[PDB]
Every structure is written in C-alpha cells, then in structure tokens.
Amino acid sequence: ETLAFGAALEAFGESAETRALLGRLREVHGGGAEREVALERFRVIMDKYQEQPHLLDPHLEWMMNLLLDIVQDQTSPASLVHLAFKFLYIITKVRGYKTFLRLFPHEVADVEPVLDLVTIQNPKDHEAWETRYMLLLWLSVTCLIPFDFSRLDMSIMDRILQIAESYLIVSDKARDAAAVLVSRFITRPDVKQSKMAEFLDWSLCNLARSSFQTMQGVITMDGTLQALAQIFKHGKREDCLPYAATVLRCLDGCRLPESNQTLLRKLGVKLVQRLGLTFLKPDVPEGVERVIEQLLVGLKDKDTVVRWSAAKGIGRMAGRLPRALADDVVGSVLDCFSFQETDKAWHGGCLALAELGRRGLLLPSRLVDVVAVILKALTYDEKRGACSVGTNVRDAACYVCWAFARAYEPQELKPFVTAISSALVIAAVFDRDINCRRAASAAFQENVGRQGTFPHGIDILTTADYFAVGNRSNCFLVISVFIAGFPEYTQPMIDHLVTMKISHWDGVIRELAARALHNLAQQAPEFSATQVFPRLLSMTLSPDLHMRHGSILACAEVAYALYKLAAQENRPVTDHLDEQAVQGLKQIHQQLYDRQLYRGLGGQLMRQAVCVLIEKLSLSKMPFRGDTVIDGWQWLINDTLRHLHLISSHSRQQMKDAAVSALAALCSEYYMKEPGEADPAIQEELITQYLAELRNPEEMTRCGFSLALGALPGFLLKGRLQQVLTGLRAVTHTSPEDVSFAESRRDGLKAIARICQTVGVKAGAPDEAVCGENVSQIYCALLGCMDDYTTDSRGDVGTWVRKAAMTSLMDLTLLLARSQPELIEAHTCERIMCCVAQQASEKIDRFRAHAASVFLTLLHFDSPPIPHVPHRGELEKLFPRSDVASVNWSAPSQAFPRITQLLGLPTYRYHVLLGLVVSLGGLTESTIRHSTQSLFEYMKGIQSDPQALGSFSGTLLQIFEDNLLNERVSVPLLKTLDHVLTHGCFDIFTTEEDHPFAVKLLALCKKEIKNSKDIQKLLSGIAVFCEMVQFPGDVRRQALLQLCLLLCHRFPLIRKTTASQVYETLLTYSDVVGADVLDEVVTVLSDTAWDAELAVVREQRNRLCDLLGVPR
Amino acid sequence: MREIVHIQAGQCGNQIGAKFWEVISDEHGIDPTGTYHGDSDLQLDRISVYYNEATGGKYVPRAILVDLEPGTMDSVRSGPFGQIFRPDNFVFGQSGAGNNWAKGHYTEGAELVDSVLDVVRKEAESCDCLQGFQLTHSLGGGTGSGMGTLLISKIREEYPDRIMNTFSVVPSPKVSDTVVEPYNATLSVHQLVENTDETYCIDNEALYDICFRTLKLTTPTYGDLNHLVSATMSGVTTCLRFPGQLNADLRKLAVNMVPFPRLHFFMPGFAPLTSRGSQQYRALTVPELTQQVFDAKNMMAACDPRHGRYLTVAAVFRGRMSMKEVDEQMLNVQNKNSSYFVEWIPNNVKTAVCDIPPRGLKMAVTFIGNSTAIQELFKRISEQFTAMFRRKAFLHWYTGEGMDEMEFTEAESNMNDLVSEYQQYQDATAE
Amino acid sequence: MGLLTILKKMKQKERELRLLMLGLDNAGKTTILKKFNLGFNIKTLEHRGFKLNIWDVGGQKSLRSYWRNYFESTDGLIWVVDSADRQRMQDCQRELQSLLVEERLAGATLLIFANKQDLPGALSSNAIREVLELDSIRSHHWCIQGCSAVTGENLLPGIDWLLDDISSRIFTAD
C-alpha cells in the first residue's frame, strides 16, 4: 500500500516460434521449398524490430548458441553451415556488428580452426558471400586478446595477413570487414612491430598505381582508404604520427577533389580530418594547417554526404587549435555567406556554425554577424528553371537557431532570441515547405522554454504546435489572423508577404498570400491604405508576369477589405483610398490593352486577375459609372467568353466561372439609371448579342453565353423573359447537327434553374417572373432532357444532362412549394418522382448516390409538405428520417436491397423495374451479383401468389415490347430474363400448356434476333430459348424448331455453341425426349462437327429433326 | 539517343529491379565484368537507352538503388552482376518505415530524399537528350509506398517536361499477413493518379494463384512470383531496346496507350507461363500463342478483361517469324466467316515483330492492354479500407505522425471518382 | 540520415533524456527538484550522469503540443496527483487517456507522484489506480509512488526504477 508496479510483459512476441525454427534446421537444409520459406519467415520476423533493436538484446545468447553448436560440427554438410551464417547475418543486420559480435568465443582455442575454415572458402562464390562476410568479422574479434602468437608457433600472421589483404580489392560487401580485420590485427602490440611498415608501403604503392577510370581501381582505392582510416582511428598517437606526413603527401596527388566519385571524396575528407586530429595533442603541424584548407573547400561539395563530414571536421579541429587560429576558422565560415556564392556554401557555413555552437567554439563577439547571417539565410530564395532553391539553407539556419538556444544560457541569448523572434514566427507559418515550418516552430518553442519570460510566448506556442502548423491552408488563413492581432507581428508579416509571396513562381502561393492579405488588412487600415496600396499599384506595370498577377489580386483584396471596414461604420470608400488610388485602379485595363498583353499562354493569368479585380471593384461600389472603363470591362468580359476554346481544358472552367461571377457583379453595379429600372440602351444591346451567340457553332461560346445569361439579375430580365426562356429551351434541345454537345445542354438547364430561382414567382406577370402561364413550358423543357443517353467515344455523356435536369427540377419544386403551391400539378409531380426513382438504380455507383439523395430530398420535405407524392405514407416507412446519414448509396450492396422494395407499389414498379433491368444484366460482376441477390431475396414473397407474379410478368413483357430494336436495353434484359428463368422463378407457369408468359415472350425473342449480326444477341437468344423448354405444349415444339434453325447459322462458332447449350439443357431438364431417342441424340450431338462444311451439318441437323419429330 | 533513367525503391522494388537488370543483360550480350561478346549488330544500335559507353567499351546501367534499411542494398552488392552497378548510386538509411506511410514519407524518408535528388541530377546531366524516368516499388510496404511517391512529386516539380513511368505492385492477404495494407496502397494511389503518365499494376494475388493452381505448387515462394514479373517487364520493354517498324518510344507510347490523363493504368501479361528450371518444353506455334495470351489465366492482374471493354491493346511478337504470317493470322481472328473466330480477343491491336527470341524459348508474346476490368481491384481495395476506417482502428498511428483524416477522405473521394470514370468509359463506342 | 543520425549519436553519447513533468500541485513538484539536484520553463539537470531535461508545464489545457516536436520527442511523464482531491481527478484521467495512446512498440514511462497522504480520506495506491484507468493502459510501464509530508520517505526506489527503465530502453553503451 505504498508503491506498486504495472503488469509487465515480454517484448519479444515470437519467442517459442523463433526457437522452434532454430531447433528444426538439420531437417530444413537439403530442399528449396523448406529453406526459402523458413528463411523468408525469419526475415519478416526480424523486420518488426528495426526501429527499436534494443528490445531483442536479452535474446542474443540462446539464438547464437543454437547456431554455433551446429556450425562447430564436423558431421554436418556445407549447406547447413552456409545456412547457419545466412541466419546469423540477419541477426547482425538488426542489432549491429559493434555489440552482437562481442559474445562469440574469443579464446585461444579458436584461432587455428577459424583460420583453416576461411582457407577453404573460395572467393568465387556469390551463393555464399554471407559466410565469408561473417567469418572476416569473427576472425577480427579474436584478434583482441593479450595472448602472444609466439606460443602458437608460413607463420600465423603470414597466413592471416595474406587473407586480410586479399579482400581489400574485392567488390562484394566483404570489403568492409577486411578493413576492420586489418585495423584490429595490425594495431596489436606484437603485429605493429614486424608488419606495420609493409602494409603502409603496400597502401602507398596501391594509391599511386591506380586510376579513376578503371572499375577495379576505384574499388581498390576505396578499400585502401577505408583501411588507412580505420588504422589511423584505432592507432595510438605514438605509432601513426611518424607516418602521418607521408600518407598525406601521397593522398594530395590522388586529386580526389577533382574526380567523379562521391565515396572517394568522402573517404579522403574523413581521412584528412582524422589526420588533423592525430597531429594535434589530445597549428604547429603543417599537415593540420593544410587539413584545414581542405575541409572548407569540401564544404562546397555538390553532394549531401561529404558536407556533413566537412562540417564535423571543421567543428572538431577548431576544438584543439588555440583561439589565436580559431578566429580564422569562424572568419572563413562567415565568408561562405557571401552574395557571390551558391546555396551549397550557405548550407556548409550553417552546418559549421551549428557545430561551433554545439561545441562552444564561438564568442559573443561573433554573434553580431551570426544574427544577420541567420536572418539572411531564412529569406534565401533564388530562381532556377521550373523550381527554386532555398529549402536546405533555411532548414540549416533553423537547425543552427535551435542548437545555440539549447547551448548557452538564457542571459547570453537574450538579444539573439529577442531579434530572431520576428523571423521564426514568419518562417513557421507563411512557408511553402511543411518540414521547415515544423523546424521553425520547434526552435521557437525551445527558445521560449529556456528563456521562460517571453512577450506573448505561450499564446504563439499553443496556437502554433507540431500538428496545427502541418496544415499550410490554415497557416495562411487561421494562424495568420491570430498572430496578426499582436501589435509587434503586423507590419513585418504584411511587408514580407507583399515582397516575397505575391511575386512567387507558384500560383497557389500567390493566391494564398492574396487571401491572407484580405484578413490581415482588417487589423491595419491606415498602414495598408497609406504605405502598401501604393507599392502594389506600382507593381502592376512590371516586366514580371507573376508579379503583376499577384499585385492585382492584392489590390483587389485590399479594396474589398477597405470597403468592408467602411461599411461597418457607414462611410464611403474614398475616405480610405485617396483620389490617386482611384485614378490608378481605373487606368489598368487601358494600359494592359495598349501593350497587347492578352496573348500567349501567359495571357490567361492576366485575364483571370483582371476579372477578379473587376469583380472585387463591382462588389464594393466604386465611382466608375458613366465612364469608358465600364465599356472596356464589358468588352473584355465579352471577349473572354468568346475565346474559351483556345484555353487549355486544365484551366478552362475557372476562367469562365470568374467571368460569369464578374459579369453578375458589374451589371448590378453600373447598369441602373434609377431604382427599379435600368438604361434601356445597354440592356437592349447586351440582349441582342447574347441571343446571337447561343447559336454560335462553337460549344464553348454557347456555354459561356448561357452561363452569362443565367447569372443576370432579376431587374435586368424584367420585360424580356419569354424570349430568353424560349432561347434557352431551343438551346437545350438537340438537332441533327448538334448531338455531341452535352455541356451546352447542361449549362442551359443550369442557367434556366438559376433564372427561375432569381426571378422567383409573381402573379399576373409572365414577363417579370415565372407564373402559372409559362411554368408548363418550363416543366416540359426540363423533362425533355431526362431521355438523354448520348453514347459517343467518351462514354455515356448524357448523365451530365440528366444530373443537371434533376437539379433544376428539384430547385423548381422547392421554389414553387414556398410560393403558389397550386402550380405543382399532380401528373407533373408524379412524372418527376418516377424519373427521379428511375435514376436511383443505375449501373454507375456515383450516379446512383446523387439520385438517391435527390429522391430523399424531394420526399422528406414539409416546408410546406409537397402535394401529389404517390404512396407518400408507404415511402415514409421505407425511408426512416433518422437513417439519412447512415446508408452509403454509392455501395450497390447497400442500394439494391432498399430500391427493390419499391416494386411492391404499382406506381413505382415500371420505372424502378426498367432501371433495375439495365443493372441486373451488364458487364460489372459485383453489381450484377448484388442485383441478382436482391432480386432473389425479393421474389421470396411474390411467387406462390399467381396474382402478383402474373402482373410482374405482364409488366416485364410490356417493357420488353417497348424498347425493341433498342440495344441499350435489349441485351441486358435478355441476360436478366435468363438470370430469372434459370433460378426457376416462374415454375408455377410450367404446369400450363402454351402458357401465355411463354408464347408472347418467345415471339418477342425471335422478333429481336432476326438477322442479328451482334454475336452477343445471338448467344443471349440461344440461352433464352433453352430456358423455355420447361414449358410444355406447343411452346416446347416452337423452341425446338427455333434451336434447330440456328444449328446452320452463317457463323461457325454459333453452330457449336448451340449444340453445346443443347447438350446441357437436355441433361438438366427431363421429360423432353424419349429415353431410347435420348442416347442417339446425345451420341449425334457428341459425334457432330459444327465448325466444318455445312454439307454434312445440314444432314446432321435433318437427322436430329427426324429423330425428334420436327419438320426441318 | 533517347535515354531512360531507372530508379529502384523498397525491398520488392530492389529485388525485381536487380532481376530485371540481370535478365535484359542476357539479351544485349553483356558479361559480369562489362565487356561485350555478342553475335549480332542489332543489340548495339539501341544499347545506350539503358547504358553508357565508358573507357574500354564498358557499358554501365543507369540505375539508382534506394532503401531505408541496409540488408537489401547489402544483397545486390554481392549478386552475380552486383559489380556492374556504380558504387555511388547506392543510398540508404539504418531504419525502415515499419510498414507506415508517414514513417517513410513525412519523417525518416523526408531527409534521405535530398541525397536521391543529387544522384538524379548527376545522372541526368550525363545524358545528351533526357526523356523520362522509371520506378519500381511495392504498395504493401512503408518505404516503397511513401518514399517513392515523394520522388515522383519531386521529379514532376523540377522536371515537368519529362515522362514518368512506374510499376506498382499491389499487395495481397495470401502473400502478406500485414493489417494496414489498405492504408499504404490507398495513400500511394492518391499520389500516383495525380502525377503519373503510365502505371503497370502487378497483383500478388494473381501470381500466387497462377503459381499454385496452373504450375501446381504446394508452398510457392517470392522466387516463383518474381520469375514471372521479370519475364513480363522484359516482354513489355522490347520496343524500347530493339529496332522495328513500329517505332514508338516512351513519349509516343504515353501519347498512344493513354488517351485520358487520369485513365493510364494498364494490365500487362505474358505467355507461355512456366516455373523456374524447366522452361524449354516445346516450340509453340503462332496460333497457339495467339490464343494463350488473351487467356485470362495468363494475366498478372486478378480481374476479367472479358467483362468490360478494351481501350488500347498492343502486341510484341518474339522469335523468328515474318510479319506476313502474323498479319494473316490476325486477319482470320478478326473475321466471323471462319472457324478461327474468337469472341475474347480484341479487334484493333498494334502488333509488332522481333527477331531476337526471349531467354528459355524460341517464341513468346507480350500483352500490353488497358481494359476497364481493372476497376475490380480498385473497388476491392476501397472495401478493405472502409472495413477498418469505420472503426478508425489503428488510425491513431498515422495521425500522431503529422497526417490527418482530411487526406484520407480526399484520397477516398479521388478513388471513388476514378472508379466512376472507369465505369463511365465502359459504353464508349462510335455509333 | 544527416540529421536523425547525428541526433541519435548525440543522444547515445551524451546520454540525454526528456521528462514531461505535469501535475495539479506546485508544492509537490518542488520536492522532485530537491532530489534530482499555463507556464513553460526548460531546466536541464545532471543526476547519475543523466543529462535530463525537466520540462514543467503549468496547464494541462495544452499537452499534445508539449509531447513531441520536429527534432526530439518526450520520453517520460511525472504527473503529480492529489490524493485528498476527488473532483479534479476526472480531468487528469481524461488527459492521461487522450495523450497516452497505443503503439506497436514500447511507449513513454509514467510516474503518478501522489503527494499529501497523511491527510484524512486519502485514497490508497490501488484506489487512485482504479480512479484513473491504469489497467487499460497498454504499451507503457507504470508505478504509483506515494509521498507523505510527515515521514517523507520511500521516494528513492521509485526514481531509481524510473531511471533504470528510461535508460535500459534507449541507452545501450553498457
């Protein structure tokens, strides 16, 4: 009752399993189905501990003993030994080769045996390199005992040295273990006196007798460099210092800095780094001086591998040389931040400064330059092709800020943090990279923590954490306004965004900056309208394309912000912006047109920016009425909508949407002589052109003009509405020349719906708004597009006109339900409901979800309750109102079981059945399966009752008779009908002779397969005919005769498919042919060629006919 | 000289790439050292597409090898042709992604990617006329799922005028027992569909079935699945490494086999399929292969090209055979008035002829289709994802790294739109 | 590599750690410093050769933000709880259930330093354990360590076990 511990558990979950695999290996070796699977399972098991390999440390004793006991066996084969090393390699992979190898035997009785083992190992064996790789590392650990080889004594250091020097040129992975072996064997006190000069001479000769062109030479030089580095690392200062100058002199003629190998340069840099420390006691050494010049030149390496080594060397060397020569190292680091340098030099200097800060090799005097140096790094960005460099520099500067913060005391970093607080909060929110923002936020949090007392620190910490920063869309908008409230984080952000991000190379960044400035301007009207708006009106006429696009959006947003701030106090807009800004904003389109800038690919951004500016100015009520600027804007808007086909489809809808949004604001802003009326001249002129452009051969122009007409206000459409409605209806219709124009019909319906929603409803005024006189024509036009199934090489593009029609009908119903409900007739409402239900059972998963949503929105509605909804009481039960957000209609597995229940209602039985037919038979396998399952589950209650099944069959036959010669429904329905007559649903109709369901259906089937070239229809008919054999009477004689005629079809595949289907239909059913007559027929069907000359096929057919008693 | 740089990522992408390199190297007549000892001049006329002339006539592959853990990089280094790879092209880390997209995308993988960008630039600077790139990884892993979707984005942002090809490998519950498989696959598909010109899906479920039933095996291994993958890749890259009348490089292919930007997934195949060791059974004829290839049995993707519609189909016949015979054979197949008519063979097919036969046969044909039947596997992956998304079980592992449910919802919405588009172009016919 | 590699090398050599000490008592936290040697201070300690990082927060309102950053992450949590208090325990339970989540491998260590035990109506070890839901916590090793102002003892083995568990995980030089 004082302190208790929690219920612990072993970290290794696969303990029994791993040991069970380690105890069944003397049976595994021998086969490739037991050794490839067993070793494949060990790899997967070991991959679950790569991040935290320390958890498997306790299990590094038995796993090794279960393998060494087998390896040390003379009776075991070689395949088991090599398999033993293969498994051991995987263990060293996870943990490592610097700890797991310290447990193997290291006695004196394990030197000669291992040396002999390796002797037999043939280097020419790629199927067993793991064995040699492990043996080279095991033999090196044995060379760490105080014993002397003299007691063991063509010698043992003559056999071990020759084998070690052999793997210094190989290309396999074993070249790394050779360096460790040579470093752990030569550094011995009895090996460094008789053999430390021979190896040095050999290495010096190899470094000179090699070149960077050959392949083997590169590997040899790499191995020699690794060996020398390992020797200098594991070598005392009283043994390597003598030979430290010759090695450096030999390494300088290697000209590693001038080559095409990164590994060689890295190894050389690391070797010279280690040499520099070897000279300096734990400067005077000429090598150390040279060592220095080398690392700083290495800081300009064009690889993100050697720069880290160079920085580490510059950081470690300075920690030895006195402060007399240390002020030189820091001075060079600062020279790497010069303007005439590449970002690589900046990154190297930042790494060097971080090393110095973490190692305390820096004085407060250097901070004066470090502050300005790190402030220039965070704002480093240069253009270069289709991208820009600067991520690594800023990341490096952020890493430098964090290290210095964690090193010195709070007092020693007061001015530094006080000055950098403004640079980190900017680089942590308005940045294009996510990692840089996270690093800046972490550095700011670290600086605020140790410093403790920080003006407004906890707020910025809680508002900007590791997760909140992750969203750059909320950083520019959500986090942007919070920190902006502080008086010491306002102008720095606005100026930064105006200088850097409105002229960026990425357009998304410019858009985000423009959207952020809209909110940042609310908390600074004077500054934004006195110092910022002038600079932006100066950048609109610059040679840079993106700069103008950004400045236009910035000015447009500032204008709307100042308009909002003025409306909040009931004041005009001129109070904020002087006359100079008003005159400048009005002289933009003129200058852009006089210079001919609306050409080429770059002309799209200019047009978009101009449209956005015009929209923002019209939505702010500017004093531009009665001025040529309005005419110029109108001409530009008309030209943009006319030249839409030239714009790429990737950015074609945005331009049209912006133009439509700007046109609606412009007219409602200037075209109004007096309240309630407008200038008849401009209205007449605009209506003229719009009624002469919807008949423009091009489809893009028609779509643009339709969307423009749809976005017009209500007062402008007063007095002239019957003509616009007739034009829209004529455009939505189709003609022999206009067939592949689905977008046109879509936009027409959208504009019709928008106009109907805008004008509303008015009694006794067909020209002013919609009323009970023209509503009938509107409904007839909206319902005429439902029977749209455009089938070009782009798929069924009639769905684009079906969805828009339903959306327009729903809006019209919702509008008329709130005003004059009498307009909503009963027959029209019933037709609309049936059409909406028909679309709630299509093959496409996405088109079925929107249909169901529209159906639920039309049904569930009581504001006020809609009149003329069929079976309204029955559907309220089918669809509970508390289950709307719990049925994914996009899944056919959740859509079929519900829509199928509508068949019970006589009203919802024709359209629903027609919609389920196309889905019951189709191509998709999952949809067909679900539909068939739903059908079989629904028929369980309408089969024993001959009244319901009879009506269902009658309706099905009636539907079959109405879409005859139509291929969009005939073939699917044939497969469906087959999907049902095989399930045996109509087994209550097979007890009748010449049953009608069968007579009419058989006639309709042969009325569809007549002269049918589509082999699919022929196969469907052949399969359907065989299903009618269950019906006795004349129906069974007619089916046999029809099947016999198809045996001599023009195509040979059909002659065989019919026989194959007959061979199955005669065996599945019974009481069809005489038992004695049945053997001969089967024999003839199995002894007949239906892909050979029709000379014999006709005779074989006549034989079967005579045997079955059928004339021909 | 149109060069094609190759890239390798993950363990499955670093195991298939080395095998493909070893395979193609046995057709261009190159030995482990580097010298050339061929017996035909038609091999050097287009060898620079994947090699570079060096001192002494030594051809060197342009391959970048990348992993977040060492083992895989250790293996290829000691392979039968691991000495032909440039020692400076191997870059990797000491900790993997633990089968976590974020672990190899927004954290561990976001650092080593910088080193991969320098190597790519160095390799591109040597080519006189760069064309595109290639990548091979897995969608069931964590370093081959997130660290390879980053490289594509970088290559697209820095080189928007270059082509990008990939060879994704969709995982299976029959080959893998991982539980978060649907997450990584969906996160990779969300990024590939947005910035990819071509894709070659390889189902681990179809290969397993073909190796179990057809080849009759009790306990198949990754060796059996890789043997067929290496064959298919080579059968597909036959018109990019050998001459022929049907001249069409990577760009021309992407312009012909991919009409719509979003729709770019293919369904590669190969036949006859055999196991390792025994392969040279008999010399198959032209019509036998013409029927064996269109067999769904010989498809590397577990779908059904029959139920749907073929958008773009091609063929690359191999072995000693004249184009006249292939034309005559295809003529009767596309004719109903003949006993040699078939209902499960496309009509419009861009066939080709090649003299050099494959390795282990005198005849072989590759199928490069683009049917809409692939939507099946897409819808299968969405159901598996929703099976665990509804509970958000194991969902706090990705959110704790930096991601958010918004990305998953956007990926699901994009996959649904792609499935709807695939289902839309199933009735696209000139009438 | 490059950054994470150097960070791991530093954490393994210098033997650095990070403890996220939280709590509802200010007097209870001062006793921890006497042994080891919304508000936000970063005070780095050096007890037993461990260069600890005592990050003491003043409000549990913001804790996800102080749990991990871009460079390093949290490795421990010394949450202080009042036994006599019975109303503000639901907030602590909710914070512990939200912050600490499940993981595929081990997780940070917890030490509910309960102070003020001699007061009347003080909940015993098991009682406060059941009041916070510590049996439903998986991937984390836990210990409830009492503390009384009268006697003031039984605090050494708790910190000893905490250090042995936080060191045997990451540190592996010995």
Ligand SMILES: Nc1nc2c(ncn2[C@@H]2O[C@H](COP(=O)(O)OP(=O)(O)OP(=O)(O)O)[C@@H](O)[C@H]2O)c(=O)[nH]1
């Ligand atoms: N066909 C095939 N699939 C493989 C092979 N190796 C792994 N896979 C598949 O790869 C998926 C797992 O990804 P891996 O490649 O192992 O992972 P990784 O990319 O290295 O990533 P991390 O484990 O996260 O570091 C599973 O679906 C495996 O079935 C192989 O040799 N052949």
Ligand SMILES: [Mg+2]
């Ligand atoms: Mg891996």
